[PDB]
Amino acid sequence: ALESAQESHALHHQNAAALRFQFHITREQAREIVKLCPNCPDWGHAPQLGVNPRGLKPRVLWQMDVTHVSEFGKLKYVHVTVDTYSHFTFATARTGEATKDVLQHLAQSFAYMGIPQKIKTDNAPAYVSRSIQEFLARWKISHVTGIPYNPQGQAIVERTHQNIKAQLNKLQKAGKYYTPHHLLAHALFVLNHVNMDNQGHTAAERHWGPISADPKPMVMWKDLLTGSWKGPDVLITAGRGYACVFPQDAESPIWVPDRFIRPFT
Amino acid sequence: ALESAQESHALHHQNAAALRFQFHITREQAREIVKLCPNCPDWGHAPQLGVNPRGLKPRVLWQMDVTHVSEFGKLKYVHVTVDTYSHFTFATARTGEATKDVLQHLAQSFAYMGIPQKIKTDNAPAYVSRSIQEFLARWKISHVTGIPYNPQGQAIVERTHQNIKAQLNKLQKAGKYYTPHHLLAHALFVLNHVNMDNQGHTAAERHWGPISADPKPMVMWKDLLTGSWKGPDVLITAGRGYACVFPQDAESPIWVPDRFIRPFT
Amino acid sequence: ALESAQESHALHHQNAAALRFQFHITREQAREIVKLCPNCPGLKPRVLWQMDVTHVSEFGKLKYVHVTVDTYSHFTFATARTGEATKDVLQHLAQSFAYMGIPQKIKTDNAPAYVSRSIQEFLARWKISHVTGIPYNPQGQAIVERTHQNIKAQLNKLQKAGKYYTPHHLLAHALFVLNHVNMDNQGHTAAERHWGPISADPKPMVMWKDLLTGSWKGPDVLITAGRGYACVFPQDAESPIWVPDRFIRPFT
Amino acid sequence: PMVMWKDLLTGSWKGPDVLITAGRGYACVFPQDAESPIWVPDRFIRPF
Amino acid sequence: LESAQESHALHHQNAAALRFQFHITREQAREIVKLCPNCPLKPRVLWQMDVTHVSEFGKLKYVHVTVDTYSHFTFATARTGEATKDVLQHLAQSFAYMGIPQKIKTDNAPAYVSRSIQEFLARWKISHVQAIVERTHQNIKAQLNKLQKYYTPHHLLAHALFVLNHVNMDNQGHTAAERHWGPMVMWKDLLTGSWKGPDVLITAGRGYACVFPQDAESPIWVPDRFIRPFTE
DNA sequence: AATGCCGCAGTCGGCCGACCTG
DNA sequence: CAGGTCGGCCGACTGCGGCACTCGAGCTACTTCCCTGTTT
DNA sequence: AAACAGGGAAGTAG
DNA sequence: AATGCCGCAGTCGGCCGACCTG
DNA sequence: AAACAGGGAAGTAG
Ligand SMILES: [Ca+2]
Ligand SMILES: [Ca+2]
Ligand SMILES: [Zn+2]
Ligand SMILES: [Zn+2]
Ligand SMILES: [Zn+2]
Ligand SMILES: [Zn+2]
C-alpha cells in the first residue's frame, strides 16, 4: 500500500488528501509522502520563528539604520537610532552619508540619549570600516553586524522609520518649517515627549524612569533547541510576538516568540 | 477642555492616548479628534470588507485571466478559466494573445466544461472588443468587466494561477515533456481528477455532481448598507472569508465576509 | 580598575565624583587622577528654563552659541548657529524642546530677537509663558553665565584630541559629557535629576555577592526570586544574574 | 429615516435627524446643520 | 456638434452645459468655449440676499440678488433704489420665483433692518439673521457681460437668470432648477496609490462605491476597502 | 458591470479502542 | 473485570503569502588586490 | 630588482 | 555576530453607576 | 469641396 502511494506520488505528485482517500492510509503517512518528494516545492509560508533581542534595561541595546526622505533634497540621508527597550528614538538629517556622518550622528545621539552597551546595525560598509569599529571599541560599545539582506534583524529600527516618516508627513502637512532640521526636531519632540503610550508613559520617561513590574508570571516554555516543553520559568518581558523567559540554569535570558509560551497554573 | 485638545492636536498632531491622558477626556473623544484632523494620514490598513461573488451551481459564474510561463518560450501566454463554485480549472498554452486566441480558448474551455451563464474577467482590451462581446451575446453568456487595476475581483483565477504554476513546476521537475501542451494537459488532469479535496471529492465530480447539503444554519447578519444586525437568515454557503446569506425579502443572495456572520441559537 | 578610570578620564574629562561613582574608586585616588590631566585645574524640573547667546572664539564662524539651562536640575543644552536672528533663535527653541520637552516659563534677556513678535507668538502658541526679566538682576544671569563658563571649560578640556570634524560634533560631545557623565556629590547625573525618577524607592533594592571575585558587589535592584535563587540585575551587567539566596543580603 | 446619532465629541444623543447613506459601519447622518454631513459609526446609531 | 456652436453663440453657457445638451466631447466643448470671443442641506432652507451695483443699466444700476445656499438657484432684479419699498418688492418676487425659504441672511443695510421688513418677515413667518452670494454677484455680472442687442435691462437680466438657472451646468448633470426642485469620502487612487479627496460619493453598496471627483468627467468606481469618511 | 483567496502545513482537540488498575 | 488512562486519528482551524502583463538599471560607500609610476 | 604609493578595478552591502 | 514589528483603528467584554421595577 | 479609407498618433488596460 505504502509503495503504491509512493509510486503514484512520484508519477503525478498528488495531494496528501488524494493519497489518503484513494489508498486508505493515515493522514500523517500521506503528509510525509508529499514532504519527502524532492520535486515538491519547499514551504515558503513559514510561521513566526525568530525574534530579535531586546534590552531589559534602558541604554543597553540599540538599533540603527538610515533611510531616504527625498523631500529634504540634499539632506535626504536621515539617520535613525532607536533604544530597543523603551522605543526612544533620535534622528538626524545629514547631507551625504559616510564614516564622518555616522560618527557625527553617533556623537549627537549619545548627547541625546547616553551611553549604550550594545549597538546592533545592518551590514552596511559604513558600519564596517576600521574607523567606526575603532571608535566603538575606544568608547567600549559592542557592535553586532547582523545577517546581510535581513531587515528583520533591524525590524525595530525599520518600524521606527515608518513612525518617523509618518510623523514628518503629518508635521509637513501641518505647516511650514525653515529647514529640515527644524521639522525633524519637532517630529522627534512629539514622538519622544508627547506621543504617549496606552499606559500613560511617554517614551522619554520610559527611557529614563525606574524599572518596576509586578511579580513576573510562570509559563510553560518550549525550548526549540531541545524540542521539549520545559518549565516553569520566569517570564521577564512579553508583548506582541516576543517573550523573554529566564530559566534558573540559563546563562542568559532566552528570546522566543509568543507561540512557544503557554500559561501555567 | 475639548477646545484645548483640538488646539493641541492641531499644533502637534499627537496620539489619541496622549490627549486622553493629558486632558482627562474619554477615549472615543480622543479617537475622533485624531480622526477629524485633515493632515492625519488615511487608514491604509483596512480590514476585509469586500468579497467576490461565487456561483451556487456548477457552470454559472466563471473567472478568466492570462499569465506568463516563460519556460514555454513562444507559448508563454497561458490562458486560465475557472469555475468559481467547484474550482474546476482549464488551461491552454497558446502562442500570442488576441481576440482570435481568446475565442479559441473560450471554445476549448466550453468543450472542456460546458456552457457558463456569467463570465467575469479583468478589463483587458481583448475582452472588450466588439468581436468577443458579440460572440458572448450570440452564445447568451453574460460578461462582467470588473474594476480596473483590481486583481481582487479576479482573486479566484489569480489563486488558480498560483496553483497551476506550482503544479507545472512540480511536473516539469518530475520529468520531461515533448511540448508545453503535453505538460499542461498532465497538470490539468492532476489538478482536476486527482487533486482531491479534504472531503473526498475531486474537482471534476464537484463540477459535475449533484448539489446536496445539510439543513442550512441560521445566522445573525450585519447588513452593511443599513448598518444593523438583522436576522436570522439562511446561510447558503460559507468558507474561509466568504459567506452567502439569502434573506426571504432579498431579490438575490448577498455575499458578505465572515466577520459579519454571527451564529444564532 | 584605576587604569580603566584613567582611560575613561582621558577620553571624557569629568570630575572625580563621576569616576569614583562609576568605577568604585576612593576619593583621593579619583581626585589625583583628575589632577593628573594636563588641562584639568526653581523646585521642579521642566518648569523654568533660561537662555542666552555667548561667543566662542574657537568656532570662528559658529561663535554664536545658544544655551538653554533648566533652573532646577541644571540640564544644559547648547547649539552653534551662524547668527542670533529670530529664525536661529526659533530653531534653537525647537531643538531645546526636542532635547528636554515643554517648560512652564522661559526666562530670557532683553535682546531684540527674544522681544520680536515671531518668538513671542511662537511661545504663546505652545502655551509657554515668556518672562523677559527686564530688571538685569544677576541671579538668573549669574546662573546662565555659570553654565556658559562650564561649557567653555568643557570645550577647552575636550580640545586635546583635535579630531572633531565639525563644531557641532565637539559641542555634542561636551554636552554629552556634562549631562550624562558629570555627577553631583550625591551620585546623580544631570539626566537623572532632570527626568525625576528620584522621588522615593518603590522597588526592593538588595545587596548582592559576586562569585567570580568572591566580593560583595552592589547593592543592586532585585527582579524576582524563587526556589532558593534570586534574580538580581547589576547596573553594569548586560543580563540578569541568578544568585543563590545564601549569597543574598537584604539592604535598606 | 429618523435615527439617534451619538455626538461622541460631547457624548450627547442629539436628534432626531435624517439619514442620508450608510456603509463601512458608518451612517452618514445629516443634522439640521446643512453645512456638511457627518459620518458616525453604526454602533452609535439608534433607529427612531 | 454644429448646433452646440450656435447654442453657445446665443446663450454662452458653460462647456459642461454644451456637452450634456449635445452629446459632445469635453475637449470639443472646451475648444468651443475657448474659441468663443465672449467667453474669456435641502432647498428653500437658508438664503442669502444682497444688492449689487451695475452701472451699465443707468438708472437701474441697483440689482438685488437672492440665492439659495443649497441649490445655488439665483434670482435678481434691477430697480431705481435700494429702499424699503424696493426690498419688499424684491422679497415678493423672490418668493414668486423660488418658493418659501426658512431663514434669510442679509447684510446690515438700513432698509434690510427696517421695521417694515421685520413685520414683513414676521407675517410671512420667516426668521431673519456671505462669500457664496458674492460669488453669485460675480457670476451674474460675468453672464451680463457675456450676453453683450436687448430691449430692457429687465429683458437682459431675465435672459441671464434663465441661462444660469436652467442652462448653466454643474458636473452631476443637474441644473440649478433640478437642484432647487429635486457626502464626502476619502478615496485612494487605485492606479497611482496616492490618496485623493475630498470627493462626493454618488452611490455605494456591496464592496464597491461610485465616486465622482469634480476634476473628472466620468465617475470613478473604487473598491470599498479604499473609502474613508471626511466628516467636516 | 464594478467586492481576496486558498493551498501548504503545523496545531488543538474530541472520539474511540487498547492498556493499567482497585 | 469494568472504570480510568493513554495512544492513534481525523475534523476544524489558523499562520502565511503571492497571484497580479515582465524586469532590470544605478548610485553610494567601503575594503582588498593588481598595474604602474616612482624608490633605494 | 624587488618594493612602496596612487589609481583603477573588482567585490559586497545598502 | 548572525533571529518581525508595532501603530492605526475596529471590536469584545467586564466593571461600575444610573434607571426600571415587583 | 466635403467626404471616405489607411496610417499614424493618442489613450487605457494588462
Ligand atoms: Ca541599512
Ligand atoms: Ca488580466
Ligand atoms: Zn511530489
Ligand atoms: Zn492630526
Ligand atoms: Zn582631564
Ligand atoms: Zn460664450
Residue numbers in the entry:
A (entry chain A), B (entry chain A): 1 to 265
C (entry chain B): 1 to 41, 55 to 265
D (entry chain C): 217 to 264
E (entry chain D): 2 to 41, 56 to 144, 154 to 172, 176 to 209, 217 to 266
Which sentences did the original study use to describe this structure?
Retroviral INs are composed of three canonical structural domains: an α-helical N-terminal domain (NTD), the catalytic core domain (CCD, which adopts an RNase H-like fold and harbors the enzyme active site), and the C-terminal domain (CTD, featuring an SH3-like β-barrel fold). Simiispumaviruses, typified by PFV, as well as δ-retroviruses that include human lymphotropic virus 1 (HTLV-1), employ four IN molecules, while α-retroviruses and β-retroviruses, the latter of which include mouse mammary tumor virus (MMTV), use eight.
As previously done for the MMTV CSC, Ca2+, which can enhance specific IN-vDNA interactions without supporting IN catalytic function, was included to enhance STC assembly. The central region includes four CTDs emanating from the flanking dimers (two from each side) and four IN protomers in which all domains are constrained to the core region. The latter can be subdivided into two inner INs that perform the catalytic cleavage reactions, which in the STC contact both vDNA and tDNA, and two outer INs that are not involved in catalysis. The structure revealed a pronounced bend in tDNA, which transitions from B-form DNA in peripheral regions to the A-form in and around the sites of vDNA joining. In comparison to the vDNA or to the peripheral regions of tDNA, which maintain ∼16 Å phosphate-phosphate distances in the major grooves, the tDNA major groove begins to noticeably widen at bp positions –1/+6, reaching a maximum distance of ∼22 Å within the central two dinucleotides of the cleavage site. The tDNA configuration in and around the 6-bp cleavage site exhibits multiple characteristics of A-form DNA.
